[PDB]
Symmetry: C4
Subunit: 201 residues, 4 copies
Amino acid sequence: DSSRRQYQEKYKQVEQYMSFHKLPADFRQKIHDYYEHRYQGKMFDEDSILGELNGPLREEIVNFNCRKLVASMPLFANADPNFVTAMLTKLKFEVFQPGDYIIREGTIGKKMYFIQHGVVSVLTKGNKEMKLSDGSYFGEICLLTRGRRTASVRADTYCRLYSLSVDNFNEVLEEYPMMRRAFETVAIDRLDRIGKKNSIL
Amino acid sequence: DSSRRQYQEKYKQVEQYMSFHKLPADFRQKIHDYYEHRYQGKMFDEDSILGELNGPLREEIVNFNCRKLVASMPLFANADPNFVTAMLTKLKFEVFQPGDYIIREGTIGKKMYFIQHGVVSVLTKGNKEMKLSDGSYFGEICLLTRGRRTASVRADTYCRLYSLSVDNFNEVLEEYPMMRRAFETVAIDRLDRIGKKNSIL
Amino acid sequence: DSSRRQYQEKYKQVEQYMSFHKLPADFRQKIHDYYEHRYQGKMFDEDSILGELNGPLREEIVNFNCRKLVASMPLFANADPNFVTAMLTKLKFEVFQPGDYIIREGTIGKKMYFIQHGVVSVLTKGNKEMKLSDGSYFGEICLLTRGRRTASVRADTYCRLYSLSVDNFNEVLEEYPMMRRAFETVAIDRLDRIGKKNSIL
Amino acid sequence: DSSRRQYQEKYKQVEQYMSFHKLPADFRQKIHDYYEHRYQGKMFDEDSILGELNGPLREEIVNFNCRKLVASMPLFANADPNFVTAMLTKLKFEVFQPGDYIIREGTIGKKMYFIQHGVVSVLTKGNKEMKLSDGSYFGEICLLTRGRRTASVRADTYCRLYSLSVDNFNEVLEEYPMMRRAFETVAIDRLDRIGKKNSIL
Ligand SMILES: Nc1ncnc2c1ncn2[C@@H]1O[C@@H]2COP(=O)(O)O[C@H]2[C@H]1O
Ligand SMILES: Nc1ncnc2c1ncn2[C@@H]1O[C@@H]2COP(=O)(O)O[C@H]2[C@H]1O
Ligand SMILES: Nc1ncnc2c1ncn2[C@@H]1O[C@@H]2COP(=O)(O)O[C@H]2[C@H]1O
Ligand SMILES: Nc1ncnc2c1ncn2[C@@H]1O[C@@H]2COP(=O)(O)O[C@H]2[C@H]1O
């Protein structure tokens, strides 16, 4: 009940904000649908809760919640459990809506994403669409090359993703160099399919 | 109502603080007028609200709220939308009152400002006033040269501005080098009109 | 009463979170036992409280609370009081449960621990268990070598520990170089007993 | 009333904390006296309040509250107003009680202090006490030399001081080099009186 009240109290402050700034009706509707999909009638203060625990508890929790994701990603399903845990521990759950530009080509990237559920489209400047779904990840190439996004990525459907900041990406990969190279191999091949090559990889 | 109550509860803590420290009447009046102009009877916890959303939503929101500003600035009205978005996303709304010294000459600057509504006066040490208003920006030269403010800037009227920290200024400009040079061209000419020249530009 | 209510209100948000994410029964039971052991029916906002005080008060407080620990550690019981205080001031109280992997071999360490009460087991990859208890500390070697954890450490019983971040470890040791070397001497000998040697030490 | 209630609610959480950790009676009494002297029956959330204002307002406020201090310090009373403002803006009000060791010789310093009201004693390792009061400042030498505290400083009476972090000390002094040298001149002479000399100064 307390968490349900929290959700309602929050959404109310959100509605009032939108009304104050007079956001268009269709946008208010999108926000409504976003809150519905992202929090599903409940609001928690995770930072506060998880912060009251300790390393092991928090690690056991994240591993439990991400079982499916871990099971659908070739990358983690075979890797060192400590690697996965190190990665899982830094993930931020996010939800994007149909048509959202999650990543735009030519810009500098600050994060990468892991797909738990949903379908996205990888779009290059020269057209050419490639779909990605459950178990796949995207947005890693720029983090590896420290260059620019090599393509755009749109949400085709609602997308439940887990993102990893560029800083946390480097921290874990600095500790597990073999996973970095695994990311490189996949990346080199990906760039090759979109007519690109980068010596950095 | 909740946001209106928030505004009232806040102002009350503000009044009590001023009374405790015994700020002069005229200052208490200025504070009253400031809160009135800045929050206009409503208080929101933007950090909390926007933080519950995601990249796209937040970007759509800021773009909506800043339509006019974007439309009155030659700088953004022609630029890459992703540039504008990158810039808009880092702006902090602020309000200054008539007679306020927004920038003082000879000091190190930590931010620049974009004028949404209001008129300011650019004042040099050797006297000479130049007015700036809606659509213009100021405080950029020091950020570019990493030197000192080349002039003072006073609020002539109430001023509704959007500020950009020195750190965010460098981050976006590091990504969009052509906008940096555009800022330079305008700056070189501005310095020239106040009898100054800087090789850094 | 207020602190007791806080504890109850917190645990309730914790239970609701676990229910939302559907954590297994046995895990919910572990969480229950954790909160019981860690907070013992009371919840305080230390950051807020201690933050209202000043250096001396806070230092006197931590010294009082850690009398026993200080008295059971050869390391501090003989050291400069200002050293101990510098160390105590940066400690974070934590509680781990039986079977928890506090430290895993081969990973990068971010902290070290001081044992106030409890018994842990130091386990090497080649098997070989060594017990550590009240008065002892562990997890320091990696901080000194900037290498990898040279062994794993499991909680044998409930463990009431005080941890020290890698950053605070370097700050205090940079100020008290002789304590660093004391840590080194013990470390060199410890590595030697697990068939290891590091020139860095 | 709201601020008065805040003070009472806070102190209550403080009393409960001390009771939980069982701090000695005399210490609980010192804490009582500390809260009485430091907050004088009122608790405000300055960070929140001042944060709602802007540069000018906040600067006018701090300048008002620190009029006396500014008027009793040879250092600021003659300096550039923008320098004083830059300094005042970074000060943290603190209160120390009789007998407190504000600074201990031989340790690394992280801040300096300005005396608004109270008397302290500068004590060297070789004995020798020198009193300092209203208008004077101390704890600056270590910040300038990046060395160690060259003496200890005890509160003789209750002391109402304004402290300046080492980071803010460098920021302002990097902008006003002539004030740094003024600090140096005084420092060189101070060290000379306690039988010390440092080429860094
Ligand atoms: N050929 C490809 N197949 C699938 N995904 C790709 C391909 N090329 C690029 N991508 C993804 O598109 C993303 C765009 O941003 P990044 O360059 O960070 O990382 C890129 C990859 O994650
Ligand atoms: N000739 C000018 N015309 C308009 N604005 C100016 C002129 N010269 C300087 N300025 C502005 O005055 C500001 C003072 O601070 P900055 O040096 O950061 O940046 C300067 C410009 O924004
Ligand atoms: N021989 C030993 N006896 C006791 N403790 C040890 C021994 N060897 C290693 N350790 C501890 O095991 C810890 C594993 O992590 P660290 O390498 O950080 O630090 C190590 C020491 O704290
Ligand atoms: N001769 C002196 N007279 C007054 N104050 C002094 C004298 N010598 C040192 N101090 C102060 O004692 C402080 C001890 O810490 P610091 O070295 O940071 O800075 C020192 C000065 O602020």
